């Protein structure tokens, strides 16, 4: 299960931002007394009954696999898209779960290593375009040959986010536009045991 709102993005200086909704991270299972178990229009029609007005949300962490309340005040005033400020999917927690991109080995010289992206440690988690086409990242990727990217980003290390910019590049010199290996599935999501680093 299976039941959630995800989060797959948050918008600067939006009611959701200022609550500390994390896109990726955390699901919106609850809004005042109405659990958030089905593909419907609860959310979005209790948003609007609460408009400028505070209202608690439950929220499930898939980092910390622990609901937390949250207190929100959806709003027309703070100048972006929607009430919250959140671009929501219905989402089950595995197909979250899966949906994370290890970067496994970096080339050199590579549009990856230029970018910054980190061998074994970083975790591509998400990408500020949902525009039409955010399905895949490999999809993702090719369709930004010779265009600079935007990818948020996941480290095993900081235990935190970053937004990378990267320019696809399949003239770079080796193979591939991006030049770093990627890892999907067993071992290589988000890992549980912290690192080594404590803390
Ligand atoms: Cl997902
Ligand atoms: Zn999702």
Same mark, same amino acid.
């Given at each position: 299960?299976?039941?959630?709102? @995800?989060?797959?993005? =948050?918008?600067?200086? !939006?009611? %959701?931002?200022? $609550? +500390? &909704?994390?896109? /990726?991270? #955390?699901? *919106?299972?609850?809004?005042?007394?109405?659990?958030?178990?089905?593909?419907?229009?609860?959310?979005?029609?209790?948003?609007?009954?609460?408009?400028?007005?505070?209202?608690?949300?439950?929220?499930?962490?898939?980092?910390?696999?622990?609901?937390?309340?949250?207190?929100?005040?959806?709003?027309?005033?703070?100048?972006?898209?929607?009430?919250?400020?959140?671009?929501?999917?219905?989402?089950?927690?595995?197909?979250?779960?899966?949906?994370?991109? @290890?970067?496994?080995? =970096?080339?050199?010289? !590579?549009? %990856?290593?230029? $970018? +910054? &992206?980190?061998? /074994?440690? #970083?975790? *591509?988690?998400?990408?500020?375009?949902?525009?039409?086409?955010?399905?895949?990242?490999?999809?993702?990727?090719?369709?930004?040959?010779?265009?600079?990217?935007?990818?948020?980003?996941?480290?095993?290390?900081?235990?935190?986010?970053?937004?990378?910019?990267?320019?696809?590049?399949?003239?770079?010199?080796?193979?591939?536009?991006?030049?770093?290996?990627?890892?999907?599935?067993?071992?290589?999501?988000?890992?549980?045991?912290?690192?080594?680093?404590?803390?």
């Amino acid at each position: 299960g299976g039941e959630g709102f @995800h989060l797959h993005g =948050v918008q600067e200086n !939006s009611p %959701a931002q200022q $609550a +500390g &909704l994390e896109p /990726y991270f #955390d699901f *919106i299972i609850t809004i005042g007394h109405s659990r958030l178990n089905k593909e419907n229009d609860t959310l979005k029609a209790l948003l609007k009954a609460n408009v400028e007005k505070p209202v608690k949300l439950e929220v499930f962490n898939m980092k910390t696999m622990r609901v937390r309340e949250v207190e929100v005040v959806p709003s027309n005033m703070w100048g972006g898209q929607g009430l919250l400020g959140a671009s929501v999917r219905f989402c089950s927690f595995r197909r979250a779960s899966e949906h994370v991109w @290890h970067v496994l080995d =970096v080339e050199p010289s !590579s549009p %990856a290593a230029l $970018a +910054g &992206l980190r061998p /074994y440690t #970083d975790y *591509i988690v998400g990408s500020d375009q949902i525009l039409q086409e955010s399905e895949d990242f490999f999809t993702l990727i090719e369709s930004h040959e010779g265009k600079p990217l935007k990818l948020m980003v996941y480290n095993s290390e900081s235990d935190s986010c970053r937004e990378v910019t990267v320019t696809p590049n399949a003239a770079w010199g080796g193979e591939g536009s991006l030049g770093c290996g990627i890892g999907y599935g067993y071992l290589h999501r988000i890992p549980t045991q912290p690192s080594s680093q404590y803390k």
